[PDB]
Design a protein around this ligand. Structure first.
Ligand code: CLA
Ligand code: CLA
Ligand code: CLA
Ligand code: CLA
Ligand code: CLA
Ligand code: CLA
Ligand code: CLA
Ligand code: CLA
Ligand SMILES: CC1=C(/C=C/C(C)=C/C=C/C(C)=C/C=C/C=C(C)/C=C/C=C(C)/C=C/C2=C(C)CCCC2(C)C)C(C)(C)CCC1
Ligand SMILES: CC1=C(/C=C/C(C)=C/C=C/C(C)=C\C=C\C=C(C)\C=C\C=C(C)\C=C\C2=C(C)CCCC2(C)C)C(C)(C)CCC1
Ligand code: SF4
Ligand code: SF4
Lengths: 112, 73, 119, 218, 79, 184, 86
């Protein structure tokens, strides 16, 4: 079942669409490859693959949203002034987002 | 008696409006009928805007140029 | 007083920016429905035909539209061309200069300036 | 080929040849248009298709007949039918008077199939680049239409282009003698064939004078 | 006048107005007569440009035309 | 006769000596370490950053980072002292006269960039010449690519040796000149 | 009406004829190519000008060329539906 999950198509860009099988003869091929990436309807194989792609891509995007939520939570736990905001929310601006002191970017962080 | 360039021989295109003007391409075949106006068939590595890499040229539009070489059209 | 020129304005401004523009627009839309409307840019107008024929009636501009106009002695040109083609005629070729030129002048483009049929 | 007797669509209400179609606002606009195009065909089974004017339709097992405002809609429906292996469909243009003009399979053979008796209309016997330059045909029959020039005119202007680059060997046209020529048009000597001899001798005199003048400081 | 812009207010720039009339009505009428002449001539010129040259005049118009003696010289002097 | 007022403010050298051809002799400019505007601008920078610093706690990490920023600002002030700045702006200038021996000269960055840019272009051209295929442009031959990238260091000599030996350029009669402009 | 011209470089593809949405083009016998056929445009009065024929033509430069003439438009060349010019 899973023995067909192979990396052999990773190097073969544009495999999913039969209009890209002729090879990258022009730079339009690159843009077409990016344009047809999520167009599961027009890609090669039967309708069952369309359903599999749609559902699994939905799950992957859901994982991406969960990763974004996790990043926000870690920023709030380890890169934030949420403690003093809890103690006095009317005098402290929320801040879970710092900037590194490079190229003077230090000027972006402000007194919260 | 064969007429035109030999098969598989590189020719330089002399058609001014051709996408491959002054380029080079292998001769696929040459039609031997004297009634054919554009008998020479030439294939190219570089496709034109219609994504076509082959075209038929006249007997007076191919000059039997040498092989392209490294980094040369 | 510094005014007293407004007596001219109270007539001219309403006139030239309301009466004249409205009359001009009405006259233009009326002119749009003449058979002569825009006869210099719109194909197939009667006046264009009359002007072209009037030009053709002038003795100087009779053979002006002919792209081959200019040959002072076309018979000499044709004879020289025929002589030059005779020495270069390929083997037992049966094409003469006269019919070759006659068939090279006659093309088949029925849909060229077919708008010269209404006016 | 025999043209059918396609009646005007305003006089053939409720015909058995009409396929069952839903009917939409996309149909031909009556009360403003009188030119209608009609396409007829014979089918084998009541296969559903799509009308060019919105909405679907079901053919009849026998004859079929549809009316459209534009020939393009009829041709689109013809391609759709031909995809379903339905040949023998004919497209007619109906004039306002009711005159029936047989249009699409004009000679009875589809245009993609070679048929004897046809002649290449609007054919040009050279590569597309062989057309004469627009600048050459100014104020001639082809003022802004260099692609309409007959091949003889194209060759003539090509020869003129070849000639008018060897500047030193050209012949400057003599300046006309306005003051002493130009009598009333009734004052002519006729003798047209003698006029070309006069041309020859006058041009010979001009060329001899030019050669003599040039051979003074050259 | 209610001035706008910083410079007019901070420099006191003013726009004087003559208390007299400028031009009397007679002078304006004198200008309007020649303006009407221009107008009539311009309408005629517009008509002539719209209709263009008529080459067929030699069949109907009287006279026999004329080329000025300098125009002939300019013709035969070259181009 | 006071060229400053004659020309509406701008002043002219009025002296023709080779010693004034250097940028350092310009009367528009002045060394930054003795320019009032330079002092005022960097003092204002120090004042603003210090005023921001006092807003935070003494023992916080933000205080230490602001101390580091203050040290960086003072180092910038002392480092640009030899750089030339205008007698009215205080902002140090960049010398683009090919001087080669002044602070802030554009000759050294120009030389460095031209070398590395020629290196990049030469590596790309070498890879394209040695991979005369479209398949090798989408699926890069990484060993050959890095070989060309490393080999590109000798571009200023190899490129010239190809220019003079007829191996860089190609005659116009071998590439598509462009659209036809005539035939008839 | 536009102007659709067929040049000698035609190789009898029939693709231009098939791509035409108003039956302007047709195939005629000829002797200038291995296909013994060239295109023709006997009914350019029905040429809307979509230039699909030019898209379908595979010769190096199109053997069929459509020249747009906007000051020439007829009801057929404009694809008028709501309005009749006859
Ligand atoms: C749940 C949401 C959702 C889903 C599942 C889809 C799914 C799909 N859409 Mg779709 N779409 C959506 C929302 C969605 N869309 C919205 C909200 C719009 C309105 C803008 C569109 C507009 C749209 C069009 C116009 C088209 C599609 C198409 C498609 C299909 C192929 C997409 C593809 O391959 O693109 C591949 C993915 C990309 C090219 C992503 C590139 C990144 C985008 C274009 C730019 C974003 C910039 C970014 C936000 C800012 C950058 C930050 C900056 C600081 C640098 C696929 C079925 C195409 C199709 O053919 O359908 C069959 C098509 O033509 N969609
Ligand atoms: C998906 C949402 C998301 C977004 C937009 C960010 C964005 C950011 N994170 Mg972050 N982070 C996320 C998820 C996210 N993170 C998750 C899920 C975790 C837990 C594993 C972390 C753990 C984390 C730490 C521990 C730190 C950041 C830091 C940063 C900032 C600088 C990143 C950097 O140096 O580039 C790194 C680029 C690469 C590694 C290239 C790949 C940047 C604003 C840094 C920061 O804010 O410094 C003050 C920092 O120290 N993040
Ligand atoms: C040209 C100068 C320059 C340079 C060298 C940088 C460089 C940087 N900036 Mg930055 N910045 C600049 C100009 C510059 N910026 C300007 C002009 C502004 C004003 C708009 C900012 C505003 C700014 C902010 C507000 C932040 C940065 C941050 C960063 C750092 C992390 C980038 C990041 O979050 O990746 C994100 C990378 C990932 C999330 C990895 C994703 C990888 C997968 C594949 C996707 C990076 C060192 C961030 C930082 O320091 O974080 C603590 C940050 O939060 N910059
Ligand atoms: C370039 C020409 C020109 C222009 C743009 C104006 C513009 C103006 N004049 Mg005026 N004027 C002009 C020449 C011109 N004048 C001349 C030569 C005279 C002397 C006869 C006058 C006498 C005059 C009076 C007495 C008054 C104006 C007034 C006005 C104002 C109201 C418009 C109006 O009703 O005018 C009407 C003006 C005329 C009928 C005179 C003829 C107008 C000119 C000569 C025609 C030029 C047309 C030009 C070729 C463009 C043609 C193409 C066009 C369709 C785009 C306006 C600011 C009125 C106002 O309120 O002023 C404060 C007013 O009381 N003008
Ligand atoms: C304000 C006074 C005024 C003006 C401006 C004109 C101007 C014009 N008249 Mg007119 N006319 C006038 C008073 C005036 N007339 C009076 C008092 C009478 C009664 C005796 C007439 C009776 C009259 C007749 C019977 C005719 C004219 C025509 C014309 C046009 C001839 C020029 C041409 O060849 O255009 C050629 C046409 C065009 C370039 C098309 C555009 C012109 C539109 C209609 C007006 C554009 C004005 C613009 C805003 C400036 C010209 C626009 C002739 C004409 O061509 O009618 C249109 C014509 O047959 N006029
Ligand atoms: C067209 C403008 C132009 C050009 C092409 C040059 C070119 C050059 N200048 Mg120059 N210069 C210019 C304007 C220009 N300058 C101006 C406006 C001034 C101010 C008056 C100077 C003042 C100046 C000085 C003071 C020096 C140069 C030097 C140089 C040379 C250094 C480059 C090199 O390879 O060094 C090797 C080079 C030939 C340097 C030099 O002579 O090096 C050879 C040098 O010391 N220039
Ligand atoms: C440090 C910041 C910085 C950045 C980000 C850039 C970025 C850029 N520079 Mg650049 N430049 C900089 C500083 C910088 N420059 C400085 C300080 C100088 C000196 C004044 C230059 C001088 C410079 C020149 C002269 C050129 C660029 C070009 C370019 C662009 C092409 C990148 C490139 O080399 O591709 C990699 C290189 C290639 C793909 C091809 C090789 C081309 C380079 C120039 C090598 C030529 C060497 C040649 C033998 C000598 C040429 C002499 C004469 C023509 C100048 C790119 C946007 C080029 C550009 O914009 O072209 C449109 C260009 O011609 N730069
Ligand atoms: C700010 C932009 C920037 C900068 C500073 C550099 C800097 C550098 N590039 Mg580079 N490069 C850039 C953008 C940039 N690149 C971009 C946008 C491209 C195109 C994707 C490349 C493509 C490129 C190639 C192909 C090569 C370099 C190489 C180099 C190095 C030159 C070799 C050297 O001096 O020895 C250190 C140097 C570290 C060369 C290298 O690393 O040689 C070993 C090399 O061959 N670059
Ligand atoms: C660090 C530094 C340095 C170095 C630098 C460098 C080396 C850089 C490089 C850079 C680079 C290497 C860059 C690149 C860039 C690129 C780009 C930016 C691109 C762009 C593109 C575009 C822009 C596009 C265009 C177009 C086309 C495609 C065609 C058509 C037209 C158009 C225009 C659209 C130095 C030492 C000097 C100094 C200090 C600092
Ligand atoms: C000194 C100076 C200056 C001046 C400058 C100049 C004046 C320059 C010039 C320059 C020039 C006048 C140049 C020219 C050139 C020419 C040519 C002709 C070139 C060519 C090139 C090439 C050919 C390249 C090639 C290559 C390489 C080598 C590498 C990469 C790749 C490639 C292939 C691209 C200024 C004022 C700024 C300032 C001060 C300093
Ligand atoms: S598509 Fe072009 S080459 Fe093919 S038949 Fe039509 S005109 Fe000829
Ligand atoms: S432009 Fe369109 S309608 Fe006209 S001939 Fe070509 S394909 Fe047919």
């Amino acid at each position: 079942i899973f023995r067909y999950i192979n990396t052999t198509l990773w190097a073969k860009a544009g495999h999913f669409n039969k209009a890209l099988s002729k090879g990258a003869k022009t730079t339009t091929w690159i843009w077409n490859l990016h344009d047809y990436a999520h167009d599961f309807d027009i890609q090669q194989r039967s309708t069952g693959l369309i359903a599999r792609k749609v559902f699994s891509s939905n799950l992957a995007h859901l994982s991406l949203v969960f990763f974004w939520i996790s990043g926000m939570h870690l920023h709030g736990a380890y890169l934030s002034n949420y403690d003093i905001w809890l103690k006095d929310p009317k005098s402290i601006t929320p801040s879970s987002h710092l900037a590194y002191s490079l190229i003077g970017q230090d000027i972006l962080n402000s007194y919260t | 008696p064969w007429v035109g360039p030999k098969k598989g021989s590189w020719v330089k295109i002399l058609r001014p409006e051709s996408y491959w003007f002054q380029q080079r391409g292998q001769v696929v075949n040459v039609n031997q009928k004297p009634e054919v106006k554009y008998p020479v068939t030439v294939k190219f590595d570089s496709v034109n805007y219609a994504n076509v890499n082959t075209n038929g040229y006249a007997l007076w539009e191919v000059i039997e140029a040498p092989a392209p070489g490294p980094g040369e059209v | 007083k510094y005014g007293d020129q407004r007596k001219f304005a109270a007539v001219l401004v309403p006139l030239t920016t309301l009466v004249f523009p409205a009359v001009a627009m009405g006259m233009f839309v009326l002119y749009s429905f003449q058979e002569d409307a825009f006869w210099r840019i719109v194909p197939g107008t009667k006046r264009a035909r009359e002007l072209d024929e009037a030009w053709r009636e002038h003795p100087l501009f009779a053979n002006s539209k002919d792209p081959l106009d200019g040959l002072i002695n076309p018979d000499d040109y044709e004879k020289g061309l025929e002589e030059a083609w005779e020495r270069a005629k390929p083997a037992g070729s049966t094409v003469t200069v006269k019919d070759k030129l006659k068939q090279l002048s006659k093309q088949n483009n029925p849909h060229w300036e077919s708008w010269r049929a209404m006016s | 080929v025999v043209a059918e007797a396609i009646p005007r669509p305003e006089d053939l209400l409720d015909s058995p040849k009409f396929p069952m179609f839903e009917g939409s606002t996309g149909g031909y606009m009556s009360r403003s248009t009188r030119e209608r195009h009609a396409i007829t065909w014979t089918a084998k089974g009541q296969a559903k298709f799509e009308m060019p004017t919105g909405g679907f339709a079901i053919m009849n097992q026998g004859e079929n007949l549809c009316y459209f405002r534009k020939k393009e809609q009829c041709i689109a429906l013809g391609k759709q039918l031909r995809k379903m292996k339905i040949e023998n469909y004919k497209i007619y243009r109906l004039k306002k008077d009711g005159t029936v003009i047989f249009m699409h399979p004009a000679d009875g053979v589809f245009p993609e199939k070679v048929n004897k008796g046809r002649v290449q209309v609007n054919g040009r016997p050279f590569t597309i680049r062989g057309n004469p330059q627009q600048s050459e045909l100014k104020f001639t029959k082809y003022q802004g239409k260099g692609y309409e020039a007959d091949p003889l005119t194209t060759m003539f202007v090509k020869a003129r282009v070849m000639a008018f680059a060897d500047v030193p060997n050209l012949f400057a046209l003599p300046q006309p003698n306005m003051d002493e020529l130009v009598p009333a048009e009734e004052v002519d000597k006729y003798t047209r064939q003698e006029y070309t001899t006069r041309m020859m001798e006058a041009l010979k005199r001009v060329q001899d004078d030019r050669a003599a003048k040039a051979a003074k400081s050259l | 006048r209610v001035p706008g812009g910083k410079r007019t207010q901070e420099l006191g720039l003013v726009i004087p107005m003559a208390d007299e009339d400028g031009l009397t009505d007679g002078q304006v009428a004198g200008l309007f007569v020649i303006a009407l002449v221009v107008f009539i001539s311009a309408m005629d010129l517009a008509k002539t440009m719209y209709n263009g040259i008529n080459p067929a005049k030699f069949k109907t118009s009287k006279g026999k035309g004329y080329i000025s003696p300098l125009v002939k010289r300019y013709i035969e002097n070259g181009f | 006769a006071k060229p400053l007022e004659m020309f509406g403010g701008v002043d002219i050298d009025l002296e023709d000596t080779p010693a004034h051809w250097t940028i350092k002799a310009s009367p528009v400019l002045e060394p930054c370490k003795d320019n009032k505007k330079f002092h005022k601008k960097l003092k204002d920078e120090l004042y603003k950053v210090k005023k921001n610093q006092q807003k935070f706690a003494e023992g916080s990490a933000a205080y230490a980072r602001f101390n580091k920023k203050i040290k960086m600002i003072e180092l910038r002030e002392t480092a640009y002292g030899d750089r030339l700045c205008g007698k009215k702006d205080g902002l140090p200038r960049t010398i683009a006269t090919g001087e080669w021996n002044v602070r802030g000269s554009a000759m050294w960055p120009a030389a460095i960039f031209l070398y590395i840019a020629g290196w990049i272009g030469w590596a790309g051209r070498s890879y394209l010449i040695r991979t005369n295929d479209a398949a090798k442009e989408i699926n890069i031959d990484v060993p050959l690519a890095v070989t060309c990238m490393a080999s590109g260091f000798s571009w200023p000599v190899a490129a010239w040796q190809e220019i003079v030996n007829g191996e860089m350029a190609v005659p116009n009669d071998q590439i598509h000149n462009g659209g036809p402009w005539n035939q008839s | 009406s536009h102007a659709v011209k067929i040049y000698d470089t035609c190789i009898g593809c029939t693709l231009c004829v098939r791509a035409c949405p108003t039956d302007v083009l047709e195939m005629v016998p000829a002797s200038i190519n291995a296909a013994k056929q060239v295109a023709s445009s006997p009914r350019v009065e029905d040429c809307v000008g979509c230039k699909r024929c030019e898209t379908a033509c595979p010769t190096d430069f199109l053997s069929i060329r459509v020249y747009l003439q906007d000051n020439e438009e007829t009801q057929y060349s404009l694809g008028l539906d709501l309005v009749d010019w006859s």
